[PDB]
Structures are given as C-alpha cells and as structure tokens.
Amino acid sequence: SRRIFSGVQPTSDSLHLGNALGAVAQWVGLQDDHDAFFCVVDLHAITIPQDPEALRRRTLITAAQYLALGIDPGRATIFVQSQVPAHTQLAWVLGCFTGFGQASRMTQFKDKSARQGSEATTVGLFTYPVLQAADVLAYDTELVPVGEDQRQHLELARDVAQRFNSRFPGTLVVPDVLIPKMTAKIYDLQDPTSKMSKSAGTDAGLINLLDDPALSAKKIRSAVTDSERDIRYDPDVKPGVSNLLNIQSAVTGTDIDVLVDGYAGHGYGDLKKDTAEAVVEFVNPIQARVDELTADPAELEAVLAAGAQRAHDVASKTVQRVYDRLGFLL
Amino acid sequence: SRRIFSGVQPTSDSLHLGNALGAVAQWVGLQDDHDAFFCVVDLHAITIPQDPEALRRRTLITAAQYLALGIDPGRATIFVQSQVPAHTQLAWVLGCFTGFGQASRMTQFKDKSARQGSEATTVGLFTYPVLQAADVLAYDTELVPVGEDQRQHLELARDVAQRFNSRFPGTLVVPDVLIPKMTAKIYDLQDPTSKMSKSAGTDAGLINLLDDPALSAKKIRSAVTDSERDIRYDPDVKPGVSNLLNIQSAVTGTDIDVLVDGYAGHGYGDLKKDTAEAVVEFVNPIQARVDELTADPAELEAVLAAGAQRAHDVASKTVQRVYDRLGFLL
Ligand SMILES: Nc1ncnc2c1ncn2[C@@H]1O[C@H](COP(=O)(O)OC(=O)[C@@H](N)Cc2c[nH]c3ccccc23)[C@@H](O)[C@H]1O
Ligand SMILES: Nc1ncnc2c1ncn2[C@@H]1O[C@H](COP(=O)(O)OC(=O)[C@@H](N)Cc2c[nH]c3ccccc23)[C@@H](O)[C@H]1O
C-alpha cells in the first residue's frame, strides 16, 4: 500500500533534466516506503510514428536510466507498458466513461495536434489520456508522482474514476496527484519561459542525461540570465537565474535559500560554472551505470521480465473486478 | 483458411429479423467451407450504458441464438469479445493509424451521438470502429459477412489495415466485405423505408426472433403496403411489399421471382398471411433451442470457453506479430 504509479515515454535516446528532477527524483524518494510501479510507456510512444529499431532500443535505455537514477528493483517494479494487456483492456472501458468534449479539451491533444497537422491527427493522440488513466487505475494506485505538465491528464483520470465509481461504488482507487513545487517545471536554458522538452527546436537549451557531459556543461554556461547581476530566487521576474538555482539545488541537495545566501556578492559566471559542475557530477555516474546495463543486458532483461509478471498479476485482477461490475460474462 | 469473422452486440433480449437474415443466415451458409469466428461483442455494447445483470444474460442469449439459428460449434468458433484481451491490444495500435477526422465522419458515430446528446457523447462511441477493425484483423480474416449498415465501418478497417501494411508490409490481412443483395437491409414493417432496428420508437414494426410468435404474426399482418394491389418486387417504389417478399423468401428459401409469379391474382392479405405463417415456422424451432440452452446452460458455457481458448490462441499471435513490427520489446 501507499501504492504509486508513474511512467515515461521511450521517445528518445536519453531522458533530460526535466524527467530526472521533475519525476524520477521524487520516485527515488518514495520507493522505500511506497509500493511503486514504474512504467516505460511504449504504447503511448506510438501515438507519433516511431522507428521500430529505435523504439526497442529506447525502451531498454529508458528502463536503464530508471535504475541508473536510483530506482531499486529490489523495492520497486519496473516494466514495459505493452507487456501487460490489462492496460488496453481498462483503457477501452474507461473510454466508455470519458466525455468526447472532455478529451478534446486536453492541452496536450491540442498542442500535439498542431505539430502533427490536421487530418494527420490520429485517434490515438486523442485517446492518449484515457490510456494514461488506465495505466494508473489498473494498479489501485494511491499516488502519482509527475511534473506539472501531466496534471491535466491526471485530473481526467480522477474524474473518470469517480464517474465509474458513481455507477459501480468502490471499484477503482481515485489517485492523488503528487507534483513537487521546486522541480514541477525545469525550463529550457535558452528560453527560460518554456519547459525543457525535446520538441524545443534546437537542443541548445536542453540537458540530456546521457549526452557528453562537457557538452551539457557548455550549454549551461551559455544559459540565458538577465541584466541584474543579483542571484535571487524569483521565477516570475528572473526565470533563467531561478531555473539554474533550481537545477543546482536539485542535483546537489542544497536548499535554494542557502545557495542564494551563499551566492551574495557573486556574479552569474559563478552560478553557471557551479551549476555546470554539479550537473557533470550528476550525469557521470548515471552514464557509467547505463553503459553497463546496455553492454551487459541480461540484468535489465530479468528486471523487466520480473516486473511484467508482477504488474500482470496485479492489473489483471483489477480488470476482472471491473469486468465483473460491468456485467461481462467471465 | 477462407477465414471469416462477424459479430453481434448483446444489447437486447432477442435478435431481430435484420440480424438473422442480414447476417447469421449467411454465416450458416459459410461455416461449412469457411474457417469462421463468430463473436458476441460485449465491449461494444458498453459504448452505451448497460445494466450489468441484463448484459451478462444477453451475452449468453445472443450466443444461444447463434446456435439456435444453425451455427455449428463443431465447425465454427463462438466466443465473447471481452474474454480475449488481444482485441483491445490491437484496438490501441490501430487507433494510432486511424485519422481523427476519418473516425468523426462515421455515420454511426453521428447518429449515435445525436441520440445520446452532446458532451454526454463518449470517447468509446467515437473509437467504436477502431475496436471493430481490431475484432476483424486480429484473426487474419479474409471475409466479413454483415448487413449493409456495417459497410462504412469495415471500409475504415480496410483503410487502416492498408495504412499499417504500408509501413509494415504483409503484417495484416486486408479483409473483403461480404454483404448480401436481397437481405442487406430488412426494413421496419410500419415504416418500410427505415431499417429494422431496436431504436425504432415502438417495436410494432420490429420482429424479434424470441417474441411470442403470435405477436410477431400480428405485426406482420399489420405491415404497411401500398394501394396498388399488385404483388411485385420493387424496393424503390414498393417498399413494404418488397420487404415482405424479401422476408418470406429468406425464411422459406423460395426465390422471389418464383414467389412473385406464384402470387399473380392475389391481394396483400395473402402476402401478409403467408409471410406471417412462414415467420412463425421460422422462430418456433429457434425458441425451442434457446429455451433449452438457457435452462441447461452447461452446454453453451462449454462452447464459449472452448471458443475463447481458440480465439485467444489465434489473436494473441497476431498481436505479437504487430508488436514485433512496431518494435516493442517482447
Ligand atoms: N521540463 C520538465 N520539468 C519537469 N518535469 C518534467 C519536464 N518534462 C517532463 N517532465 C516529467 O517527466 C515525466 C515523463 O515525461 P514524459 O513526457 O515522458 O511523460 C508522458 O509522456 C506521460 N504521458 C507518461 C505517462 C503515461 N502513463 C502515465 C501514468 C502516470 C504518469 C505518467 C504517465 C513526467 O512526470 C513529466 O511530468
Ligand atoms: N435491419 C437489418 N437488416 C439487415 N441486416 C441487419 C439489420 N440490422 C442489423 N443487421 C446486421 O446484423 C448484424 C449485427 O448487428 P449489430 O447492430 O449487432 O452489429 C454491430 O453492432 C456491429 N458493430 C458488430 C460488430 C463488432 N465487431 C464486428 C466485426 C465484424 C462484424 C461486426 C462487428 C450486422 O451484420 C448488421 O449489419
């Protein structure tokens, strides 16, 4: 109990600082006293066309980064979404309890639709949050740790679970949403008002965990700041400075107000230099672990096989409970 | 091979003459030389709210009517849609290859949306044809026998299969659509220009297989005809007369032109009387078999268990083929 669920799409060869600090860092803090299911969501990945060889490789490398970021397979369950049929079974049912207008109002859908273009927009891009709701509800999940960009989808998940329970009392757990304050949004280093994301345009403002560390350090030294020459935490008026403090605090464990106090009299050169140095120290051990998990794959394959078995054992019972309440012949 | 697939929704306590003559009659003719999968589609049924006790009972009674209409479990596979997870797995994938505009243009969606009302319209009503495409493609289906009302959905299924195969050559079988000419649409007896359907308003023009036969005979004697006093086959100008000839021909096996020739000099009283008598002879053996399958349920439960096992063995391999082509970790 204190059951928790969270997922990441295997859409690129590396997670970025947004994923690591907005999500996985909180997962690591929760796994020792929460029963945790961490998922690589390859079914969601194909809502955009994906190269098959890359998709398989990136599924593994995403799970590898979980382990390398501190996720403990002795304490948590790591598995691949497509390997547990219950997700799509529950997604079908929950679609029958999701409003069409409700789904069309999701920001992601609109943004994603704009990038793909219309009549090229597919049903899967539209039903995305219904499958996401199924991912969570299948495990009787009590809490979902994510970044801010996932909030609207999880509010749909809660709404749909409540609507289902309205007709079938007590069937699904309504999950609580757990979104950290400081790292809810890590921002792009070149446009500190946009969240760090792979669809940025160029990756000059994007910090990939597995990129050459000297390259990430360069990007950080080039981060956009302001003209004030005052290191002070204020996301609204000082986006780039605040984001750098956020990042350095998150990867070092030093509170911001302590960093800010310790930065009195310093310029932005030292803020960027120190943040770059802290990030390099952060990613070097991650990369070492990921390299070994990739070169010696049997360990990670055993973890995913074990995780799929345990995820199937839990999620299939949820489906049978839901199917029984609906009145399906069993 | 000559693999065939078809389904009926368990949405009422009885099939009607449309279902029996537009679909199941052709199934019976195909099953001896075609490898056939006949499905009770309970996942589709819940795209509209369903009473659970009724839904379970009607799932059984729909499968019972298959057997009572002549479907042979020694030659064909009968099973319940929800009992085979592969259907929802493939539905998710096919949604990723279905256009949003494409789905919104389905007539059923629009009609069904109009009856349910908007913002009360759900995602499942919208994704209905994607799951229907999955039902068919999961079994490498070569031919699909249905009535005319299913044509537009199966053209989507073919379009989506072709689009998928475009990226992943040779993965899915593109099915042919098999829609009979004479019984493509059985029309309501009180409004012979509308197809016989449960959403008619009143059931005075609807012939349920399992209704009291004297009641169905009454409805037929009250069928709307015309003022011509000439028994002649012409669906466009003589809808009610043509529909009655269609029905009597289909349940007796007598060709229409032979019935029409034999009706020279007769009025519509004899057309309705004879059609009512033929329908009573048609439904009485069906009802006898359905009553026994309901009172002694172990036989039908064994048929559905066997069918689900065989359907799972086939459809799960299709899913694994599709998953492999997409590049999912297996
Ligand atoms: N710049 C950023 N700052 C802060 N946090 C960020 C940033 N970018 C990403 N995140 C967080 O990282 C996690 C994974 O993001 P994805 O885009 O893979 O995230 C996604 O695409 C989801 N649909 C995956 C998903 C599928 N099913 C689920 C069930 C529960 C939770 C999540 C899921 C997320 O927590 C996200 O909030
Ligand atoms: N008045 C009529 N005249 C002639 N034929 C008719 C009439 N009314 C119904 N039919 C036919 O009966 C079958 C079942 O209809 P449903 O409404 O259950 O049919 C439905 O609701 C489908 N979505 C079920 C389905 C789900 N998956 C599938 C895959 C293949 C084929 C069918 C399906 C159909 O063949 C239908 O054309």
Side-chain angles (χ1 to χ4, degrees):
Chain A
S1 205
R2 306 186 79 181
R3 178 78 56 74
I4 64 161
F5 188 95
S6 205
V8 178
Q9 285 195 69
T11 45
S12 88
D13 303 314
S14 175
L15 301 191
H16 57 65
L17 278 181
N19 307 127
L21 305 178
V24 184
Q26 287 72 46
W27 305 1
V28 171
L30 295 162
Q31 71 187 335
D32 293 341
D33 52 3
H34 294 66
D35 182 12
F37 284 82
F38 303 121
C39 191
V40 183
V41 291
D42 56 341
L43 297 181
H44 281 285
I46 59 156
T47 54
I48 303 285
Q50 304 287 321
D51 173 73
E53 295 160 69
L55 179 59
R56 181 163 301 159
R57 181 186 74 237
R58 290 165 181 167
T59 297
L60 290 163
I61 209 72
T62 300
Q65 283 167 97
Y66 290 7
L67 302 181
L69 278 158
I71 300 301
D72 181 353
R75 294 181 178 121
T77 294
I78 303 99
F79 73 108
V80 178
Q81 185 186 34
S82 68
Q83 294 182 9
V84 180
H87 290 240
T88 64
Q89 297 174 283
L90 188 57
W92 174 260
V93 168
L94 294 179
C96 292
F97 292 78
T98 307
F100 182 90
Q102 182 174 16
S104 64
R105 276 167 258 141
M106 297 294 102
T107 300
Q108 289 186 46
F109 177 69
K110 323 207 208 122
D111 291 359
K112 284 184 184 206
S113 151
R115 281 83 193 127
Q116 291 281 298
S118 196
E119 274 275 335
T121 293
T122 81
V123 169
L125 206 50
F126 175 70
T127 64
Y128 191 115
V130 180
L131 175 62
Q132 179 165 2
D135 298 329
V136 172
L137 303 171
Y139 297 92
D140 296 334
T141 298
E142 298 183 357
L143 275 163
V144 179
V146 288
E148 183 64 30
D149 53 292
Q150 294 308 303
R151 185 187 294 279
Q152 188 185 36
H153 277 196
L154 301 178
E155 288 164 347
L156 185 151
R158 289 171 45 84
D159 181 68
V160 173
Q162 292 171 327
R163 180 146 55 256
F164 188 92
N165 282 334
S166 193
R167 280 205 48 212
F168 309 107
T171 310
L172 303 174
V173 178
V174 185
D176 307 302
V177 166
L178 192 69
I179 289 178
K181 175 57 144 182
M182 307 307 320
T183 55
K185 222 169 208 55
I186 305 300
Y187 293 92
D188 180 276
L189 301 187
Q190 286 304 119
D191 175 9
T193 62
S194 299
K195 91 162 194 281
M196 181 172 296
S197 150
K198 302 289 187 121
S199 309
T202 87
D203 295 340
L206 163 87
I207 304 300
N208 292 312
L209 294 193
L210 305 183
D211 270 359
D212 187 301
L215 170 66
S216 296
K218 206 174 97 217
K219 292 184 192 178
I220 288 155
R221 296 190 300 259
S222 313
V224 168
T225 47
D226 56 51
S227 55
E228 284 193 3
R229 287 208 32 88
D230 180 44
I231 300 184
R232 182 184 66 97
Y233 189 68
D234 200 316
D236 276 332
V237 60
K238 303 169 68 58
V241 165
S242 306
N243 186 54
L244 285 172
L245 286 164
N246 213 338
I247 286 155
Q248 187 191 345
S249 169
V251 298
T252 63
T254 309
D255 278 326
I256 272 158
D257 53 336
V258 163
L259 283 186
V260 162
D261 185 74
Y263 267 135
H266 292 261
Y268 298 159
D270 294 331
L271 173 58
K272 299 194 214 81
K273 200 207 73 210
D274 295 348
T275 305
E277 290 187 2
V279 169
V280 163
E281 293 305 306
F282 181 66
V283 307
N284 269 333
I286 296 159
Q287 295 182 8
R289 183 75 194 283
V290 170
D291 290 342
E292 168 71 16
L293 290 168
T294 304
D296 186 7
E299 171 192 351
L300 175 66
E301 309 225 332
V303 161
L304 295 178
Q309 180 62 53
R310 202 212 163 196
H312 169 76
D313 290 341
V314 176
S316 56
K317 291 181 180 49
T318 304
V319 168
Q320 288 309 115
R321 180 197 322 141
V322 165
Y323 278 16
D324 180 62
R325 300 287 228 275
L326 289 162
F328 294 155
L329 196 72
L330 305 175
Chain B
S1 205
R2 306 186 79 181
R3 178 78 56 74
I4 64 161
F5 188 95
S6 205
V8 178
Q9 285 195 69
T11 45
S12 88
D13 303 314
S14 175
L15 301 191
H16 57 65
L17 278 181
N19 307 127
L21 305 178
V24 184
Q26 287 72 46
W27 305 1
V28 171
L30 295 162
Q31 71 187 335
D32 293 341
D33 52 3
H34 294 66
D35 182 12
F37 284 82
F38 303 121
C39 191
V40 183
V41 291
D42 56 341
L43 297 181
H44 281 285
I46 59 156
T47 54
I48 303 285
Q50 304 287 321
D51 173 73
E53 295 160 69
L55 179 59
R56 181 163 301 159
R57 181 186 74 237
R58 290 165 181 167
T59 297
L60 290 163
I61 209 72
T62 300
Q65 283 167 97
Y66 290 7
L67 302 181
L69 278 158
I71 300 301
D72 181 353
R75 294 181 178 121
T77 294
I78 303 99
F79 73 108
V80 178
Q81 185 186 34
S82 68
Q83 294 182 9
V84 180
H87 290 240
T88 64
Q89 297 174 283
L90 188 57
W92 174 260
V93 168
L94 294 179
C96 292
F97 292 78
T98 307
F100 182 90
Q102 182 174 16
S104 64
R105 276 167 258 141
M106 297 294 102
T107 300
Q108 289 186 46
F109 177 69
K110 323 207 208 122
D111 291 359
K112 284 184 184 206
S113 151
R115 281 83 193 127
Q116 291 281 298
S118 196
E119 274 275 335
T121 293
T122 81
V123 169
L125 206 50
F126 175 70
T127 64
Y128 191 115
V130 180
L131 175 62
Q132 179 165 2
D135 298 329
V136 172
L137 303 171
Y139 297 92
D140 296 334
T141 298
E142 298 183 357
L143 275 163
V144 179
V146 288
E148 183 64 30
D149 53 292
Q150 294 308 303
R151 185 187 294 279
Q152 188 185 36
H153 277 196
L154 301 178
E155 288 164 347
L156 185 151
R158 289 171 45 84
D159 181 68
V160 173
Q162 292 171 327
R163 180 146 55 256
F164 188 92
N165 282 334
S166 193
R167 280 205 48 212
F168 309 107
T171 310
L172 303 174
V173 178
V174 185
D176 307 302
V177 166
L178 192 69
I179 289 178
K181 175 57 144 182
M182 307 307 320
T183 55
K185 222 169 208 55
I186 305 300
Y187 293 92
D188 180 276
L189 301 187
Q190 286 304 119
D191 175 9
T193 62
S194 299
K195 91 162 194 281
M196 181 172 296
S197 150
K198 302 289 187 121
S199 309
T202 87
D203 295 340
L206 163 87
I207 304 300
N208 292 312
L209 294 193
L210 305 183
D211 270 359
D212 187 301
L215 170 66
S216 296
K218 206 174 97 217
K219 292 184 192 178
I220 288 155
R221 296 190 300 259
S222 313
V224 168
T225 47
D226 56 51
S227 55
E228 284 193 3
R229 287 208 32 88
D230 180 44
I231 300 184
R232 182 184 66 97
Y233 189 68
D234 200 316
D236 276 332
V237 60
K238 303 169 68 58
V241 165
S242 306
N243 186 54
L244 285 172
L245 286 164
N246 213 338
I247 286 155
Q248 187 191 345
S249 169
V251 298
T252 63
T254 309
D255 278 326
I256 272 158
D257 53 336
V258 163
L259 283 186
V260 162
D261 185 74
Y263 267 135
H266 292 261
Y268 298 159
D270 294 331
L271 173 58
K272 299 194 214 81
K273 200 207 73 210
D274 295 348
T275 305
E277 290 187 2
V279 169
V280 163
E281 293 305 306
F282 181 66
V283 307
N284 269 333
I286 296 159
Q287 295 182 8
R289 183 75 194 283
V290 170
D291 290 342
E292 168 71 16
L293 290 168
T294 304
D296 186 7
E299 171 192 351
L300 175 66
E301 309 225 332
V303 161
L304 295 178
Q309 180 62 53
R310 202 212 163 196
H312 169 76
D313 290 341
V314 176
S316 56
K317 291 181 180 49
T318 304
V319 168
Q320 288 309 115
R321 180 197 322 141
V322 165
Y323 278 16
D324 180 62
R325 300 287 228 275
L326 289 162
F328 294 155
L329 196 72
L330 305 175

